Design a protein around this ligand. Sequence first.
Ligand code: COA
Length: 544
Amino acid sequence: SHMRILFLSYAFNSLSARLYCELTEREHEVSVELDVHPDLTVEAAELYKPDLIIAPFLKRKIPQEVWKKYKTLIIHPGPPGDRGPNALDWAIMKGERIWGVTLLEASEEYDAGDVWAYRTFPMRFARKASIYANEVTEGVVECVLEALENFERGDFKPTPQKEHWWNPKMEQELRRVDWEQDDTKTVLRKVYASDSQPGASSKVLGKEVLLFNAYPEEELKGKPGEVLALRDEAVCIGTRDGAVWITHMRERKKESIKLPSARVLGEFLKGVKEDPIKPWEKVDFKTYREILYEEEDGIGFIHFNFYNGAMSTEQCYRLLETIKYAKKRPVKAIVLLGSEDFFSNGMNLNTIENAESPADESWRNINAIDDVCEEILKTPDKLTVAGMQGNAGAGGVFLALTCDLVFAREGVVLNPHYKNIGNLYGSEFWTYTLPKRVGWEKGKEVMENRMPISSKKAFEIGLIDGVFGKTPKEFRQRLKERIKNFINSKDFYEFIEKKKKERTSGEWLEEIQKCREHELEKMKLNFYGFDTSYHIARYYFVRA
Ligand SMILES: CC(C)(COP(=O)(O)OP(=O)(O)OC[C@H]1O[C@@H](n2cnc3c(N)ncnc32)[C@H](O)[C@@H]1OP(=O)(O)O)[C@@H](O)C(=O)NCCC(=O)NCCS
């Protein structure tokens, strides 16, 4: 029943984290070993002595020694028979309508072992990272549990492969976006297949770039490869039959990092102008909308789609303005939805790394995100709800904790800690927000744990107020009908009664102001003190 499971992964990536939660919270024992030289590999399997080895995420062969002695199951983001190291890249380039994930045995030939479990699913037209993080991740969880059942039963035999194919590593020539020859659909497919790594190569404004995060543009028209407009640092680029937005780019050099396009293109954008669209405007054609505000049934819904959940200083202020617009609206509740792939991951570490002074940009970013939290907290006459459709970590978790209610989809993974970014003290009113939910003893325990927890475990400990839904869309529906019932009851007014009283009294405003002050002083030491752990850890996070 209580198996001992050793993870071999290249990195402790999102799928490895999700599996870790699913098995850990089922009373199993999981050791994670980030694949090293095959020697530490053999030696660590010796020392740890597992019942079962999972490889959620490998980029090299497991030593024949190890898996001939321990049952070794490999995750493959393809249907049974699909072999190769870029399964999803190829599935998307080839326009596959149906795809799947396979759990197969380790063997001497790459991806040729017998199958222990698989799932199939209809393929969305979407970024690779998002297929991986939703359909692939969910399927892999089902496979592993099934294999765990088949294993503890001891009497299971895997299905040898039959029909099978090999797709080699994909070269950049196949990904290259050629603006004069490629229609919008072809550019979406190329960028989708390279998002978020390695990027689709291209030439923009004479500069050689990698493209990331593409959105079709249905209104603006021009010459293929022309930069039509700017919009919140994205650029709109003419294609063969229309236009496409690209929010993020990377120079094709070694030391450079993904940044907003306007920061990569920089001074080359002299001519082009901004083409704004408020989050509350209504628009009939497909365009790029970073933040979206929509009112349904007396509720204000704020969508914000910050690439990779990273919140730049500037994006914090765009969000704060949409919150201020909502608080002046005929709505009883205000729901922050993030995006379908992330709720939030706190400060944009890439825009911090890129700034002249990362400490100063770190100072701007933490104050801006604190200004968002403060605005949420000081909403005495309205209900506020955090809706975690996707994962969240570091400052993004505590952004959500400032809302009256925090709901999350099933499968959401949380990292309520700064153990990966140099032990930042954190802010976002966590000294107020966190103990009001779990007490100072547990809250500090939460922040000391570098391992993730599911939205399920977070609910159990009282960190959040409810988990439900299997998909983003389901979660959205159930969340709406749950908030809908509450503001249509006498409980809603008896709740604003208390909240109006406390959150306008001077003893509360000064309480929370002393919290923001105490946190920023610790964070100021983190950004400028002698101990440079935070800057060291940011450097490696951003260049991996
Ligand atoms: C939260 C976290 C544990 C999730 O782990 P995970 O499931 O393995 O997800 P990943 O790190 O692989 O995220 C995928 C992408 O999102 C990016 N990303 C996530 N959070 C980011 C952030 N705050 N800033 C910039 N980029 C971020 C990652 O760089 C990664 O980039 P890539 O796809 O180009 O390789 C992890 O992403 C993390 O440590 N983020 C940093 C958050 C932070 O410290 N913010 C500053 C304090 S508020």
